[PDB]
Write a protein that binds this ligand. Sequence first.
Ligand SMILES: O=C(O)c1cn(C2CC2)c2cc(N3CCNCC3)c(F)cc2c1=O
Lengths: 390, 50, 150, 50, 150, 150, 48, 36
Amino acid sequence: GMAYLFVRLPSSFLPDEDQGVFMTMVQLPAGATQERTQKVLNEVTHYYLTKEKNNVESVFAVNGFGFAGRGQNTGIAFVSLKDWADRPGEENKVEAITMRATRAFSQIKDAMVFAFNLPAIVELGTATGFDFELIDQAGLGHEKLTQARNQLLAEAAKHPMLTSVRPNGLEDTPQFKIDIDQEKAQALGVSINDINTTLGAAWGGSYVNDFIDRGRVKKVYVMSEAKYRMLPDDIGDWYVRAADGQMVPFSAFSSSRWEYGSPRLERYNGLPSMEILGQAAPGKSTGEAMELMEQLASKLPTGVGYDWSGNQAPSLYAISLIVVFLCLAALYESWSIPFSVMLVVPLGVIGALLAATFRGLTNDVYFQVGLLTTIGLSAKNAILIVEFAK
Amino acid sequence: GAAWGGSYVNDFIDRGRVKKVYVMSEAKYRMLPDDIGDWYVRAADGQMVP
Amino acid sequence: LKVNQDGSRVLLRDVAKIELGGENYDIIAEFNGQPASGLGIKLATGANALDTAAAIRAELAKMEPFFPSGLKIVYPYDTTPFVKISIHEVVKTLVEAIILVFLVMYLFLQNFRATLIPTIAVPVVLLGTFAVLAAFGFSINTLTMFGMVL
Amino acid sequence: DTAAAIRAELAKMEPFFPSGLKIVYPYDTTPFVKISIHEVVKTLVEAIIL
Amino acid sequence: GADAKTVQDTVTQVIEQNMNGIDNLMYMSSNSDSTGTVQITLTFESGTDADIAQVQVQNKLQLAMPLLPQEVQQQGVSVEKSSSSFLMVVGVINTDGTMTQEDISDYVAANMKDAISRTSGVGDVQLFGSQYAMRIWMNPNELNKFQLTP
Amino acid sequence: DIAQVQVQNKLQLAMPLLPQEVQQQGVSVEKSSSSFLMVVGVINTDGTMTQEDISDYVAANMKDAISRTSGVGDVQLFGSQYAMRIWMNPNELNKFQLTPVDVITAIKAQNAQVAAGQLGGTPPVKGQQLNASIIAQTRLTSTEEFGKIL
Amino acid sequence: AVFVPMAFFGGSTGAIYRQFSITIVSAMALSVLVALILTPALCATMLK
Amino acid sequence: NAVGTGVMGGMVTATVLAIFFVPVFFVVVRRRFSRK
Ligand SMILES: O=C(O)c1cn(C2CC2)c2cc(N3CCNCC3)c(F)cc2c1=O
């Protein structure tokens, strides 16, 4: 029994617990603005302020800063839960708070918002979960690599004893490409220097110089009122001076056309890569899923490689078997006492398993050492049953 | 300097990895000292000079 | 910028609007749906954690007094009081595990003197572990505190 | 250990080589380490047996 | 200004080539954003000194420093200690003498922020808004009717 | 470890006292060991390529990683990495009336990447529905395109 | 003989299983030394 | 709860089993004596 009470008991690392403090991020579709995402951040903030007064003490919204990266797509609001005395029930604890919260954001919305117990753990080591990555080893482009990732994410979900796999954050939004015909430019009499710092110092921003403000030196930027750089028709508003002391429209030398680029290009180890955050199956666990994912990445096109309790214990406990017998003979020389104690091990451990298999515990770090201590007392007890009787 | 020796002008992209762009001259116009006169520089008054 | 033919002075204000504005309008914070800014301190790979955050207030303690009208501080997402509580609930267990041992000691040893030796044995053994793990490098971590208790 | 990891990093460039591109090893320290250990540990056992 | 492709191979790649010859290291990674913002991460072996390991990465970056756009050079190049996780995130609001989510972001970043990042081994401070800057908003029609450029 | 830092954080005070040709060139500070160990030859047999084609592919796939990997002081490269090489004919410059200064300037103008801003700017107008990055000039790709510089 | 051999930690499970045993392994030697010096002394001195 | 649930189980079952019933007696019997 003991064995089956242990192999079947699932293995975690360290238990995620209430911290009086959690958070939840936002993610809008391709090329959303600051005004669109701000509408969502309001709805998020108020599920916490009106439908969670008893629980929430104070929110702290932020618009344009996710933990993917940045941009007018992203967002996040930091929560600060009222202290634990005023929060009595299991429903008044973050397991249940992020349950009906995440439910609310998948219900009455048209974007993507989650919520999570801050991994008390460390960022890494979720257990039954992985972080895959897809390298372009050969001279393929970002567009060809993308297609291999669409075939990887497809094939895992095509036959998942499953898995749950998704990309990390390469939404792939369009971009307003402006081709400057170089021949045209110089015929009208303009320097390409001046043309580049028109489009650069108007639409984007340009660090010109520093000035003094109330003691502390700050910066001086130059751009343009919002309304002259909102849409692609406003490009023609800007007239540049030409050699022959007279203005020239952008449209003259300009060419307007859209394209499909990506707003964030990851690069793992000197080469372009794309992150693939997938988890272990609801049945399987890591070593299974991981090695059942290396065979799927090796079935992709050429020029596309990859790169990613503990195996710990197996060997650790091995020395726990060796040092015991010797210490069970440094005061107990015979080869009779060194096999007595050797049975109290699973005498007690069967129950340690049993108490944690019965309630909602797991094989985490505190339990794995709850075993070692259970054995140290098992030795004690038995060694008195021996030392005295010998 | 940019004929006989070499000059780091700018960087370009080649198959993903950014490399360099150099400028010089075919070997045969910089092998002996008589080939110095081959190079004519522009002068202020829009005309060449040996 | 220029002086056109008829000595008409073109200034920087005539061609453009000039206000003292933010350097970066990409992000905007609203504490409980009300406008505000703050400071989100991040740790330094190997920093002292609870001592860094204790000194976040120490340095911040002397900016407080020279604030103008209305400018006040407020605390969301804060680690501090979880440290405070895990110590307090473990040290609570410590004393409970003593007191409870003292009753089992009296139930078997009706001698009062006898329920006193083991009661006054392990108090010392715990302190030595603070003196030993301090000498080896460890802290009062979440881990080493359950190590006292276990 | 550096030279053992010269192969380790180099082990994953191997497979994506185009037609004809193959590796070869001149001037290499490795097998002298391999042999001096093997001839000394050989002496060790000889000195026991004897 | 720079888009995702510009930063990808004018700042990103330039460093990644000149980011070698360093002790203790399993991998590097990168994120080159469309806001014109790249940031590389090098993870080292467990127990390696973060004190020396910083120096090595940042005294090798600074060989590729003059291989970078001059816009980027005068911009903030930083090498710090990572810890993807905040702890103290001190909100700072107004109640009486009302000011905007921009006025506070400046005063916070012109009184307190400078000190915090320094103080007690703070890896790097985050600022929720931005410090003030003499902002100008060039009207294009007003530049044309006098005959001018940015 | 420390001795390197000291030499290279003192060199970099004389860094701006150097020719600009040298600054954009490779300044390096490394660990010496006048003695190779592994010198991995890399040849071709089937799909024949020259002693130049291989020197590039070696230095654009493996070299970057090796120098980094397991405390490699500095890597030697037996050949050179590729580079858009140009061979200015002097007679052909004279018969149109030109110099290498006009060739160099034409590459530092047409062959570059530019930081154009974005639609739906950092501070937009309230109610905009789009936000996408503008593209400008691109760093050139192939020989063909460097042949068509005006 | 079961604590310190398992206190040979590894990876991100470093101080994790390490501090695990040692803390209490330290507490074993301190409980032994007390059970060899103090607990004896006191027990003799004054038990009944 | 993660610590104590793991030990409580062990202890209940270590002692009430060892001291009585199963090995911790039954051992030295067939280990010391049995055959040698
Ligand atoms: O008993 C010991 O092993 C130590 C005792 N002490 C205290 C003095 C009694 C130390 C104090 C140290 N610091 C004190 C604060 N300034 C820096 C030095 C220290 F780093 C180590 C030790 C010991 O190892």
